[PDB]
């Protein structure tokens, strides 16, 4: 009855869609896109005297800033780079009382923030954010959808990478190598700060959301071997940071592991 | 501050029962461990047993048939209790407190434990 | 379990130079890239104080001339300037698995 329904339907609103964009490709479609992007310039170029108005740019310095990377947006790696240089030239330039009483008295997670505090007096949750989105979220999931084991080689620990290996190896034997885009990652927070030992070892839980495709190609002929050029997938990724009290001199690392990464 | 005292029970009878209490103050029995290291002067030191941070306890081997070790929270107390005391266990006792990476920072004062008759 | 050693059971400098500690293990304490030994001064009448803690970290309170360095099986202690309080008894203790154990002890003194 209504489980016959949805092999009927969706092939017909699909029928329709084509022939959609037949209306869309078309002259008339593509002139009266070109024309509403032309259109779009000149308006852009008469509301430019408006925006060019000094009041307009001094409340825009007050607005506008990086926060908007907190609303989403992916970053090329040419333009990760120098922004990781640029801000590198700028740093080198029975309910009893006592547990109500007890909101000030220190935590857990109070012992592993001043842990990473005493390894390193920069050390906040907004700054560590702050540069946990803008560079090392976007290149460690750029290096792990792009196969990119070099990257991979530095930031992993002994498990994790020998797992990526193993894995790989597979992909090696399948005569396939992969390739894929990360189109948009949102949601670079830090979920809790634990203890995960029981010789008490700081760690750190990170979780984020991407848009990612995965799909894998021949290297002798280049055809598609598995996945799909439209079917755009979501994916989470949750991961356990930890940091080395020695190699904190070590550049293009800055002493941080990855311990755990899992993808949901 | 963070302050560790023991009790003194000394000079026990052989085959006797050893009870020590430490007290702490600074800190909290939830969220910090214990370990129990004695010191004889003839076999160096050696490790009998800790209270973990998550409640649970452990023990050494060699030392597992007669140890104890039980906690108390609300007093800030934490007993050690060994059942069995022969000669060759006349030492000093100590109970420390263990934070970061495993390392045994604050200590007690130390008992002085004899064992004759 | 991990029978440890250290190598200068006797030792005597004169004021102002190094003194070296050497710590050898019989296994590899080392656990996601870190190394868990410990270094501990004990005074005569006192009971021990924590100085090193995971290899490469000073203790609270303790002055920078100790200095603690190594990894896989053999781990040292360093003292550059040598001071006249610091006549004392020195162990390393491991704490990596399970039965936990302390070294042999070392005697420093100053002629």
């Known amino acids: 009855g209504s489980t016959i329904v949805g092999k009927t339907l969706k092939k017909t609103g699909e029928t329709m869609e084509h022939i959609a964009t037949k209306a869309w490709e078309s002259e008339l479609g593509k002139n009266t896109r070109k024309a509403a992007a032309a259109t779009a310039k000149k308006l852009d170029e008469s509301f430019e005297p408006v925006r060019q108005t000094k009041i307009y740019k001094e409340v825009s310095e007050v607005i506008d800033d990086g926060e908007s990377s907190r609303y989403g947006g992916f970053i090329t790696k040419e333009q990760r780079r120098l922004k990781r240089e640029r801000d590198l030239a700028s740093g080198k330039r029975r309910k009893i009382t006592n547990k109500v009483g007890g909101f000030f008295a220190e935590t857990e997670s109070s012992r592993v923030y001043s842990q990473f505090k005493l390894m390193d007096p920069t050390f906040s949750n907004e700054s560590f954010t702050r540069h946990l989105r803008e560079y090392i979220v976007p290149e460690i999931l750029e290096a792990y959808v792009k196969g990119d084991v070099k990257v991979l080689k530095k930031w992993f620990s002994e498990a994790p990478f020998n797992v990526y290996a193993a894995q790989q190896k597979i992909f090696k034997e399948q005569d396939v190598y992969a390739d894929g885009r990360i189109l948009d990652i949102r949601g670079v927070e830090i979920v809790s700060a634990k203890l995960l030992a029981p010789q008490d070892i700081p760690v750190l839980v990170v979780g984020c959301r991407a848009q990612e495709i995965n799909l894998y190609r021949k290297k002798k002929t280049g055809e598609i071997a598995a996945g799909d050029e439209a079917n755009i997938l979501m994916s989470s990724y949750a991961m356990v940071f930890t940091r080395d009290p020695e190699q904190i001199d070590d550049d293009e690392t800055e002493g941080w592991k990855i311990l755990e990464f899992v993808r949901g | 501050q963070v302050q560790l005292k023991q009790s003194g029970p000394g000079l026990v009878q052989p085959s006797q029962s050893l009870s020590i209490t430490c007290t702490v103050s600074?800190?909290?029995?939830?969220?910090?461990?214990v370990h129990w290291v004695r010191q004889s002067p003839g076999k160096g030191l050696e490790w009998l047993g800790v209270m973990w941070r998550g409640g649970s306890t452990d023990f050494n081997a060699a030392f597992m048939s007669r140890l104890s070790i039980t906690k108390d929270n609300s007093k800030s107390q934490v007993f050690f209790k060994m059942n069995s005391l022969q000669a060759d266990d006349t030492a000093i006792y100590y109970c420390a407190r263990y934070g970061n990476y495993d390392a045994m920072d604050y200590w007690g004062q130390g008992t002085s434990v004899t064992v004759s008759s | 379990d991990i029978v440890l050693t250290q190598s200068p059971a006797s030792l005597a400098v004169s004021l102002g130079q190094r003194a070296t500690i050497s710590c050898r293990a019989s296994?590899?304490?080392?656990?996601?890239?870190?190394?868990?030994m410990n270094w501990f001064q004990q005074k005569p009448g006192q009971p021990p104080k924590l100085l090193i803690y995971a290899t490469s970290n000073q203790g609270s309170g303790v002055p920078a001339r100790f200095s603690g360095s190594g990894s896989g099986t053999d781990f040292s202690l360093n003292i550059h300037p040598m001071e006249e309080d610091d006549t004392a008894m020195y162990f390393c203790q491991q704490s990596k698995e399970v039965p936990r154990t302390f070294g042999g002890g070392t005697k420093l003194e100053i002629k």
């Open positions: 600074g800190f909290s029995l939830t969220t910090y461990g």
């Open positions: 296994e590899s304490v080392d656990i996601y890239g870190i190394s868990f």
